Symmetry: D4
Subunit: 231 residues, 8 copies
């Protein structure tokens, strides 16, 4: 009796199953930025209140990439002299973390899926260049003495979904570099997070641990070019 | 006991039944463009990165038409000399595919419903003009030697929901030509898709197969005039 | 066993109960206009393609009013000479239908609730001025020989939520006249709808019967001043 | 049998549990303002129709603060001469109510949570300065003879999420003062609400009791700088 | 000797003769409004600080009409009920002054030239409707008992170059009624000016006598649609 | 004595000589459109009130071209089907008039100077295609039976300085075809002007003879992309 | 002979006499701000690079007032706490300099003409409040011990033509306080200028002496509401 | 007789002397860009049609600087990697030409005046780095083997009045580097100009010699931030 009716109740709930699953957001975040397209002018400007005069930093982010090219920028900090200060991006299947210069990069192979949220986070300290990438909370890659003894200066432009090219011409950003998908939980810290801290940054009810420099839901992140807040 | 309570549980879930059903999206697409009204200025501009110098193409699309007139444009590619290069549209009850010139068209009669999503897709190769229309994955119509030996040139304007008229006067598009409804999953390929490929393009978890020329969620599709992204 | 866990399943579904109920829309309409506030500049312009040279008309509408004043305009058609051609509005508790002139009005007392959708609809034919108001499908009021032998001319401005005052000064509309709430299913017909037609216009799956003059989801309705499309 | 199936039914409903919980709104409010970030230009201007020439007032509000600093403004009324006429704000953990002057403040310690809605409401009468703060319906703090014999004049600017600084320079608001979170049910009364009235203002189906001076869903509350209506 | 070189000096000054003559402005006026075209939406809004609750008024204007149709509006004040309260316009060759309603008007035949500045001033007192038109300082046409015992109420919209038709439709102003040319010295008084005052208003150094209700260079005149301030 | 001081008077007037000469305008025209650069999106839309359903037409224009390429468009009228209905342009040194189609055209060799105003007027009647080009009032080149028995239809877009390419893509107009310089006195007639009328149109005090279809200072000309009205 | 022709040469030059006189600018200034009207929202923001933490200051300005009311503001610097820090304004016929607060002010009677440029410069040093007003280079009125021992703090907003009221309400500036006319040569110094320097600031070729804090043609002055640069 | 009246004629012409002198433009240039202030965001973008893949180039510009700081940029071309490719700027009194990098530069001491137009042209060929600076047509300073064997690549942004800092942050350009004054005749050539050509570029009727890469009145120059075209 009850089982038979439960059959049709489940059949009905199937309609809302996918509708709720498609708009699900990771952690406890109630807002995210949507890049519906790889444009020549789509990006998001971040305006940290605290200066970026940082020697050690651990930048985490929740990403869901619809299409990943040879080079797709998640977030990137770049000054006038050197546009590749901090730059997390995605290759065809790997994740690349660039600190200091374009030549100093750390690559973690084949642990990013397209339509699934992943907590990509990258740590780096200037004492000996001990850089690491954690994906979904477990170590993905690590290297030492890369960009060692380097300090990212102030005045640089930090963006999400693009690299420093400027939009004083009505865009001008390289389309192939753009990011198309969803971003949330963008946090940057002034110190190397501990292992447990990195694990708990990408948990279930974890969208309330925000960095001091850039904090999701606190810092001025304004999208441009077509990106929008999908609350 | 449990059955009685299940009665009221189902009665309660009835309230969310329609609310979830009305905003349901086809395939796995999490975003779509809404044309709430037939205006003189409503359309959506598409900006393919790859040039449209194509001899064979298979253009798929998910459409839900609120009202269909004698001539309602779903998508249309048109150059300066000939505005009817590629044009998929809807008659009162039939679906029309135009390639090359307005005289060359293929008509499939009475398989489009108003308030229901349908995966209209049109294939065409210039070797002998073998054109086809598949609706919901099964062949709807086919013809041979139409617009044969024709090449759609570059520089043309591609739009969704309207035809090439231009909006340098504050609109100017013919209202009767406009489209009012919902569009999603707009993909254009550079080659004739195989039968299984066409079948799987309009499946359940099928909103991740995108064309190389125009790909939903990848290409710059910007609405104008009142059209908007209903995420 | 099953009953006990069903208790907590219902407790869980309670959280989504109200969230789905609050954004529920009447009929089968998937889109509506939200007037969040009574501003000096909030309204919605309607642009019928067919001229308003009508002798008989039946104008239906779905309304949910957050706050109703001495005079709150739902929709209003007004020419340059006479701004009170057609005007449906709400008094403190009654519904008023004005056709032809401000002196010719029909009042139906105390059948409008604030936070609940109601299908207010008004019919009028110029042969003898036989005007009627139906609320939720059942007759609310009726009168004869009011504005008889009158023809509403063309060129008039039709708005939803305000009356004809113009916004060439940055607003100027009377705040007290404004409408704050939700509107959907705005339809105007060129003929007096039959009783069954009026009953089925405000049904359950009834948001696909649209008028020839103004049709919800077909005609150009553009909000202004703060009103927005709440899909 | 039924129990086993109910196990996976609950497992499935878990996906929509959090999705519905994250966008839940308090009382019966169907609309709210979202401050996604602490910008230099984010706020919301309120335009009461009735003048603020009030001697006694009870200002209620529903707030959900993502991050609370040393000084975070929920709402603030300020004239040209004295910008601190009325100002409700949040310290690190306490709630502060300022009436008349910045020196006259009432502080209620440690009853505000970050990610949870709370019905903060403040009452004040000028007969003897008997001011009170109610949090979630129960008394949080109270004092007497503070700003006694004072009248808040007219012409002042009332904002939500910021204090009176002006935005004729492209912002200029102090970032640290800004509010980042969600606001709803902003009501201001011309008289001291009774205890039962304050209790029922922050109830379950209580988002229909609105003040005469400022009423949520009635008064012109236009956000600026990045604040949004999250319907 | 000197006489011979004077010929070349005059020939040189010839190049600046016309260039200075074309941009010459009448009276001592240093600024004027240019209506380059008869757009569908060209006009200028006037926002008098003092209310238009006037019984007797004198209104002057310096006009240079590039093209005059059957009906070309210089300025027009109109309320919601009656859009033809005050309206000065030009027929093919005559000047028409309308006060109260279209039925009662004053016409002065054939004293307006196209490319030449003319100082048109219409006066009217409600005691007996004694209305007069003065062109370039000399009386043109006078009538008595027209719109007698009439009072132009407040709230009406006053414009230059168009009638009261509203621009909430993206224009909508009748193209034919538009004004294309140059306007300056728009003044409206609360009392019928004396003959000597009328003569002095249209003098040489006379762009410093301005009306109390509307005063050129003091009142808020906002051009729209293509009209611009030609300083 | 007088001659000596006249020397310095002439020396002084030298400073204003060039300043007045550079901003000189031809005919009695007091306004003109300036195309400072050959932008990708610079043009001017023209919106004739009278439809372009014309069989015979004479079109004049005063032009001062800063730089003339292989193809520089002064004005161009083009429909959706055929964008080359009417098109007057400049080759490296010649003036080209196109009516009907690109195949049939009239060319007048080497009578256009760059920095000097020239009055180019092309006439054409459909009775036998008798087309003529008049430069500065004297006939330049005439031909017969070109585009004979052809009628330019309605709906076509008419622009100055560009072709019909549409700006819904944020521009897209071919840069090379653009016009950079100054334009004025754009007039189009519904009949072939007589020889004396053609001479008078390009006279000294001749900026008051305007066409019925398009008339300078009467028709609606909207510059776009960087073009502006240089009064 | 020469004298006779010189008569007509002078008659010719008469046409350009007034045209050049009306647009004349004082000093060697090549640009100025025009306030065509006393709008509700007309002003000009000034953004000094150097902070206003000044104890002694001299502030000059060239002013030409079309209409002067009971209180018309030339420039005004005001902080959040005290909006009347520095404020130079005009009464019906006198010039008023306000430093520190409203109570302490300096008044110079009847030396301002409406349509004539005047060089008003107010100096003030905090050692003993020795404040002075210089009009056209000759001292107008001086006082001692007014606002003595006072320091104007930083963060205050400095405007020309209005007070500190804010425009986040779409204006809100008091209309009466507005300034309508022309302004130029706005300079503010960090030290009390010497008498010879004061005289030289208002000379003939004197639009190249600019203050260190605010300098005309160097400091960032943005007109708003209708004000514009009349070059 | 004639001499006496000529005295007053000269006295009258004195009034227009300065008014014509202040708006005088050099060469035969009829248009120029005005930088009224040193805003945080004032500049002008230049969009050369021909790519900047140049080995030898000569770049001229007419400049009139109101205020010159330690570093004031006239024009600057900079790529992403190296923002200092080409950069002409002014020190306190000298003119500096930078090609390749900041380390290698050419300085010409003390030949720039503030309020006077000067024709600064820098030439450089990569064969041996033979760079030269010509001021007003006479060589100022030359050097050899500086940036030798260097090629300025494509994609770099070229601006007038600022460096390459990007305006995606709502400005961000360094205020000190900005340029405040007037610019015209901006030309860049693909080959080192000859000495006679250099002299002719800065002549009297010399505003018709324009470069192939960037040509004044041909290339797309868009002012931003407050800069405007002073025709
Ligand atoms: C992938 O991108 C890198 C730079 O990010 C590039 O060096 C490499 O060649 C690319 N792989 C290709 C093009 O196959
Ligand atoms: C339907 O549209 C076609 C063109 O798309 C037209 O030829 C045909 O006449 C229309 N049918 C009608 C008007 O009944
Ligand atoms: C209600 O409104 C009507 C006009 O719509 C007005 O005549 C009447 O006086 C109002 N009732 C009041 C003010 O009590
Ligand atoms: C908290 O803010 C108050 C003012 O609102 C301030 O006086 C106090 O010092 C702050 N507490 C700190 C800075 O620890
Ligand atoms: C001129 O205009 C008036 C109304 O302004 C109109 O009545 C009259 O017919 C017009 N004259 C014509 C059309 O010849
Ligand atoms: C000049 O332009 C025409 C088309 O307008 C073109 O056919 C011709 O080749 C051009 N001349 C050249 C490129 O030398
Ligand atoms: C002039 O203005 C002052 C304040 O600026 C005011 O106190 C005074 O009353 C005014 N004079 C009048 C209103 O006659
Ligand atoms: C002038 O500017 C240069 C850089 O352009 C700088 O190195 C130098 O120190 C400056 N001179 C000063 C600050 O006196």
């Amino acid at each position: 009796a009850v089982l038979e009716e439960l059959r049709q109740t489940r059949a009905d709930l199937h309609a809302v199953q996918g509708w709720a699953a498609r708009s699900w957001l990771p952690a406890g975040c109630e807002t995210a930025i949507l890049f519906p397209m790889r444009s020549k002018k789509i990006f998001g400007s971040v305006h940290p209140v605290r200066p970026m005069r940082l020697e050690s930093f651990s930048a985490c982010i929740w990403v869901k990439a619809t299409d990943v090219l040879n080079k797709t920028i998640l977030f990137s900090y770049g000054t006038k002299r050197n546009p590749y200060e901090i730059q997390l991006y995605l290759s065809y299947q790997s994740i690349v973390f660039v600190v200091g210069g374009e030549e100093n990069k750390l690559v973690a192979e084949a642990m990013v899926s397209l339509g699934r949220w992943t907590h990509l986070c990258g740590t780096w300290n200037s004492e000996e260049g001990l850089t690491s990438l954690w994906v979904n909370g477990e170590l993905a890659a690590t290297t030492v003495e890369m960009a060692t003894g380097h300090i990212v200066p102030e005045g640089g432009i930090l963006q999400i979904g693009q690299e420093k090219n400027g939009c004083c011409v009505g865009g001008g950003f390289d389309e192939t570099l753009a990011f198309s998908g969803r971003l949330t939980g963008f946090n940057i810290w002034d110190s190397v997070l501990s292992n447990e801290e990195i694990r708990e940054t990408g948990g279930a009810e974890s969208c309330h641990i925000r960095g001091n420099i850039v904090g999701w839901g606190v810092t001025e992140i304004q999208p441009h070019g077509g990106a929008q807040y999908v609350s």
